[PDB]
From a paper:
The I-BAR domain protein IRSp53 is a key player in these processes, acting as a hub that integrates signaling cues from Rho-GTPases and phosphorylation pathways to initiate cytoskeleton and membrane remodeling events. In the inactive state, the SH3 domain binds intramolecularly to the CRIB-PR domain, resulting in a compact, closed conformation. Here, we show that phosphorylation of two pairs of sites within this region triggers the binding of 14-3-3 to IRSp53, which inhibits membrane binding and the interactions of Cdc42 with the CRIB-PR domain and cytoskeletal effectors with the SH3 domain. In all the structures, the phosphate group on the phosphorylated side chain engages a cluster of basic residues in 14-3-3θ, consisting of K49, R56, and R127, and additionally forms a hydrogen bond with the hydroxyl group of Y128.
Therefore, to study the binding of 14-3-3θ to the pT340/pT360 and pT340/pS366 pairs, we determined five crystal structures, allowing for direct comparisons of the structures of singly- vs. doubly-phosphorylated complexes. All the singly-phosphorylated peptides, except Site 1 (pS325), bound 14-3-3θ with ~1:1 stoichiometry (i.e., two peptides per 14-3-3θ dimer) and relatively low affinities (Kd ranging from 5.5 to 16.5 μM). For the singly-phosphorylated peptides, the electron density is symmetric for the two pockets of 14-3-3θ, even when two-fold symmetry was not imposed during refinement. Specifically, the Site 2 and Site 3 peptides contain a proline residue at the second position after the phosphorylation site, producing a characteristic 90° bend of the polypeptide chain, which as a result exits the 14-3-3-binding groove, thus leaving a significant portion of the groove unoccupied. Although the sequences surrounding pT340 and pT360 are closely related to each other, they are distinguishable by the presence of two large side chains in the Site 1 peptide, Y337, and R344, occupied by smaller side chains in the Site 2 peptide, E357, and S365, respectively. Coincidentally, 14-3-3 binds with 3-fold higher affinity to pT340 than to pT360 or pS366, whereas its affinity for the two pairs of sites is more than 100 fold higher than for individual sites. The two pairs of 14-3-3-binding sites in pIRSp53 have one site in common, pT340, suggesting that pT360 and pS366 act as secondary sites in these pairs. The doubly-phosphorylated Sites 1,2 peptide (pS325/pT340) also bound 14-3-3θ with ~1:1 stoichiometry and micromolar affinity, suggesting that it interacts with 14-3-3θ only through Site 2 (pT340) thus ruling out Site 1 (pS325) as a potential 14-3-3θ-binding site.
Numbering used by the authors:
A (entry chain D), B (entry chain C): 337 to 345
C (entry chain A), D (entry chain B): 1 to 230
The structure:
Amino acid sequence: YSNTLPVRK
Amino acid sequence: YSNTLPVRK
Amino acid sequence: MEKTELIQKAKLAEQAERYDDMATCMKAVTEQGAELSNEERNLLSVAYKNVVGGRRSAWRVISSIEQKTDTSDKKLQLIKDYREKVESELRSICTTVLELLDKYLIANATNPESKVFYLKMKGDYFRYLAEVACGDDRKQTIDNSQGAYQEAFDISKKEMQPTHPIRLGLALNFSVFYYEILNNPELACTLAKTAFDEAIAELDTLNEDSYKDSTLIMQLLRDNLTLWTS
Amino acid sequence: MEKTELIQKAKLAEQAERYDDMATCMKAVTEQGAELSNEERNLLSVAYKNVVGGRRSAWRVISSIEQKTDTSDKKLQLIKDYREKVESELRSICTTVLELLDKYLIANATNPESKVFYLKMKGDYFRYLAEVACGDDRKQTIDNSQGAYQEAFDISKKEMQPTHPIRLGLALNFSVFYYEILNNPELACTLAKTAFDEAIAELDTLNEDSYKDSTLIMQLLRDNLTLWTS
Ligand SMILES: [Mg+2]
Ligand SMILES: [Mg+2]
Ligand SMILES: [Mg+2]
């Protein structure tokens, strides 16, 4: 998957 | 911790 | 909603990791009053294990922080109150499960395998209550857990082969009860060890699927033994 | 509850992974009308990202299962109904966040770094709305997401160094918006790679924390570029 911020735990 | 069944996912 | 749709929705919820919904579905299935199949039993067990597990882990985190905090710290009351909220949610979940077990699942079970599965579950959720109980409440809650485990254990020894995954999972959780709740590591080790040894003695008579199922749980018994004997 | 107690509780809820409580706390902190600290903005962002994330992941799973469902399958409508239920929850979460942004956070922001942070957040939650919208609602949500991102992008280019973690995180999510929502992988790559390259220069001026954050973002930019270029 494409990375975004913030990240869920 | 100790192992028990079932487990969380 | 009718049973077939409830099961479909429960499996969809499981895939989506929406375990509250999954549990709600399986509670509705249970309350319909018909005996559960092994697949339906697993769905119920998986759903509520995930629902309760969230509160158990939160409680462990909060209580560890509470213990580390200075008793005169003005911040302590908030931490304690928050722990109590999580405790109330944990109790609600355990009570719902135990009600399902008493009113429907144990009451209608027609074979020893299902009865052992449900009495194990009764022991499990009373054990979760015992982890957070204090005082006299704790003594009775521990008694309730132990009595369920012991009855399940006796039935399983009489009615089931030592390699049966339900009998092995029962021994696993019962040994953890001895270790963590009764604080007797020696009896916990012997319980898990007996279950493991009696199982290896019969492994080679299973097909490879059942061999896989039993081996997995036996390794968990040995994992616990290794942890406890260090 | 006062601010200090709400923050203590929000951090406690975070440690326990109780993100609904965490979001309620930071929501209360915001609705008091005061500008948030960097710590407090981060607490708000982490809280609501975890709240919405479970719906987004569930939605992806459910929609995926719906696609593989035969159009004539009598079970299809149940899947659609469950998808729409998850969608409804996701909208409510996004609406709550967007209202917090337009009524308190964006309006009261004083420095450009904060205004970029909130405009980025607005782009993010309109982007989440756009992932599950169809037709005109999709067009409008894409439009509101892009407008927030673009303004944040312009401000960040005007006021902030290219190594600043907030400007870098904006570029990261804005590039993903181009890739996944506008379906323009070429512009998405250039947006990510431009931000990455321009950040390389100023790394010799950051302190410990900023260097760790900025480098973490730069690695995510490079990961996306690797994924998108193969
Ligand atoms: Mg109290
Ligand atoms: Mg108590
Ligand atoms: Mg819809």
